């Protein structure tokens, strides 16, 4: 005996759920053309196995970075705003926002597509950082991301104007503290009246445990290829899994909401 996708739709449609917290990962940007991390074959971590890194995860490790920052900057150049557009997944979240129902959007992605899709900064927690800002690794001077863009685009490792130190984008590396705005989770998760989890394997903390931080009465909707994380191992009474392609799953929710025409209009106005 389980809730259905329609049940969740109808909670939203009626404004019974008005404080939706959303958690996303790299699966939401595969329909925009960006690989995820862990899909066999196409994921980034399967494909860095072939390069001169001790293991794929070294691309986000500081000792490796100091030894050779080139791989990380190759990734920065590709992900700096400009090459990808948000997809219907992102724009569903923007529609939810514009209807006044989004409490917060927590993202593990570094592609910046939530900001690109028009989610206001106050409504967004970029929990693994952003290319919007950068910090000198030597003197700790902060820079806007726009300052290093020309170097990044030019296949040049950006150096600090004062100390000549490598200027690193504010992407969270292993062992670094999460961003200040992550503090909001303390208030947002107890307040959420609905949790939506999209396109994440829930292999990595803190997002795996954050799925547990909503009240035990709160429905949790997973839209993902696979049943993962606490949703697989620690199910709750009001969980719902919409398994399969994320665009298909979102479009099925949208249809159940009666928002198809509005979604089509939004996507065409933003991306047509
Ligand atoms: N089109 C799609 N439709 C549905 N599900 C999809 C699709 N594409 C991929 N998936 C699912 O999307 C999920 C993608 O999982 P992962 O690749 O681990 O990404 P993360 O965001 O959770 O990685 C977390 C952190 O780990 C890193 O170290 C970085 O720090 C990351 O921020 C899988 O379950 C896919 O089956
Ligand atoms: O949606 C996201 O935010 C999460 O997925 C980000 C995936 O990044 C793929 C972009 O990297 C492309 C450039 O290749 C890196 C080269 O590494 C050096 C290998 O030698
Ligand atoms: Na994204
Ligand atoms: Zn410096």
Q: Where are the domains of the chain?
A: 1-30+87-127+180-272, 31-86+128-179
Separation of CA 18 and ligand 1 centre (Å):
27
Query: In this structure, which residue's CA is closest to atom 32 in ligand 1?
Result: 108
- Three-class SS state of 256: helix
CATH number belonging to domain 31-86+128-179 = 3.30.1600.10
Two tokens, residue 100: 């006044």
Give all strands of the β-sheet with 142-144 in edge-to-edge order: 142-144, 129-136, 167-171
CATH of domain 1-30+87-127+180-272: 3.40.50.1220
Distance 204 CA to ligand 4 centre (A): 31
Residues in contact with ligand 2 by the CB-under-6-Å rule are 26, 29, 34-35, 44, 48, 51, 71, 74-75, 78-79, 109-111
Catalytic residue among 67, 90, 97, 128: 128
Report resolution in angstroms.
1.3
Experimental method: X-ray
**Cβ(185)–Cβ(11) under 8 Å?**
no
Tokens describing residue 252: 């099925």
Do residues 182 and 125 touch, judged by C-beta distance below 8 A?
Answer: yes
Query: 18 — phi, psi (to 5°)?
Result: -125, 0
Cβ-contact 103, 188 below 8 angstroms: yes
Neighbours of 160 (CB within 10 A): 21
C-alpha distances (whole Å) from 131 to each of 15, 113, 205 are 35, 11, 21
């Amino acid at each position: 005996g389980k809730l259905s996708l329609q049940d969740v739709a109808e909670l939203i449609r009626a404004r019974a759920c008005q404080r939706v917290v959303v958690m996303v990962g790299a699966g939401i940007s595969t329909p925009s053309g960006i690989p995820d991390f862990r899909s066999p074959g196409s994921g980034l971590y399967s494909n860095l196995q072939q390069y001169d890194l001790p293991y794929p995860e070294a691309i986000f490790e500081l000792p490796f970075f100091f030894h050779n920052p080139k791989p990380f900057f190759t990734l920065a150049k590709e992900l700096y705003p400009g090459n990808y557009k948000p997809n219907v997944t992102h724009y569903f979240l923007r529609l939810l926002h514009d209807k006044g129902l989004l409490l917060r959007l927590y993202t593990q992605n570094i592609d910046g597509l939530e900001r690109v899709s028009g989610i206001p900064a106050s409504k967004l927690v970029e929990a693994h950082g952003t290319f919007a800002s950068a910090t000198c690794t030597v003197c700790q001077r902060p820079f806007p991301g726009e300052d290093i863009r020309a170097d990044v685009m030019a296949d040049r490792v950006p150096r600090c104007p004062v100390c000549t130190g490598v200027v690193k984008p504010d992407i969270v590396f292993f062992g670094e503290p999460l961003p200040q705005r992550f503090l909001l989770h303390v208030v947002d998760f107890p307040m959420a009246d609905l949790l939506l989890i999209l396109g994440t394997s829930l292999e990595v903390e803190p997002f795996a445990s954050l799925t547990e931080a909503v009240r035990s009465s709160v429905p949790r909707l997973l839209i993902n290829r696979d049943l993962v994380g606490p949703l697989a191992w620690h199910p709750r009474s009001r969980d719902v899994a919409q398994l399969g392609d994320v665009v298909h799953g979102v479009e099925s929710l949208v249809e159940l909401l009666g928002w198809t025409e509005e979604m089509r209009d939004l996507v065409q106005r933003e991306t047509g």
